[PDB]
Structure 1
C-alpha cells in the first residue's frame, strides 16, 4: 500500500511524511534550527547544504520523532528526511538526477539512505552489564 521507509537511529525512530508542497520542512510541530542543546545544530543542517535548496522547494515534509536520548533522535530525523525525499522524488518525476542526488548522498554519508543496524546488547547475569562480570573475591 505505502512504503513510508522512515528512519531509525538506535532505538529512536523518526518518520518524515512527504507530499506535494512548498519545500518547507517541519520537525514535530516545529521548524528545524531551534534545537535546545544546539550542539548538533549542523547535524540537522547537513542535508540542506548537502543536496541544495533548489531540490527543497516543492515538497512539504512533516517529521515525527520518538525514542530516548538527545542525540539518538538526531541521525534519524535527517535520515528520514533524506529517504522520504528519495522515495517521493523517485516515484514520480525522473531517475537520472535521482541517481545524481543518491550518489551525492552516498559519497557524503551512506547512513542517510540506509539505517544503522547495530543496537543494544542484552545483559547476562553475574555482572553489572552485558559483558562485564562482577569482581571475583580474592
Structure 2
C-alpha cells in the first residue's frame, strides 16, 4: 500500500494478525491523542469486514497531524483491496481508493495571498 494526501505520505504494510494498528515505530494512541479522528482509519477496514483481522504497520513522513489521517486511510485502502479483489467493489465506492486532489495554492504577485488582494477605495 501507499497513500498520499496534502504534503504527507503514508506507506502501509498489511499482514494478518491481532489488529494493533501500529504507526511509525510507536503505538497509534500514543501517536494520535484524539482517538475520535482515528476511527475513520478503520473505514478501509469496516466497510469491508476485516476490522480486527490484520495488524497494520505504517510509516509516516510530513504533512500535519490531520494530514496523515487522510493518507493512512487511503494508504491501507489500496492494500486491503489488493489482498483480495472482492474488496474493490465496495472500497472503490465509499471514496477510499480516490486520492484527495486538493493542495495548497501558489501566491501570485500583486495579491496578498493566493486569491486575496489589497483593499480597494475609490475616492
* TM category, shorter: 0.7 to 0.9
Q: Tell me, yes or no, if the aligned pair for 2:38 and 2:69 is still in contact at 8 Å.
A: no
- Paired residue secondary structure (2:117): coil
Partner in structure 2 of residue 123 of structure 1: 107
The CA deviation at 1:37 is 2.6
- Kindly report the root-mean-square deviation, in angstroms, between the aligned alpha carbons of the 2 structures: 2.4
The number of equivalent residue pairs is 120
Q: Which aligned segments of 4 or more residues in structure 1 are displaced greater than 3 angstroms? A: 30-34
* Ranges in structure 2 where 5+ consecutive residues have no aligned partner: none
Partner in structure 1 of residue 78 of structure 2: 83
- Paired residue secondary structure (2:39): helix
Instruction: Identify the structure with bigger relative contact order (alpha carbons < 8 Å, sequence gap 6+).
Output: 2
Question: Which of 25, 41, 46 is the matching residue for 1:49?
Answer: 46
* Ranges in structure 1 where 5+ consecutive residues have no aligned partner: 91-97
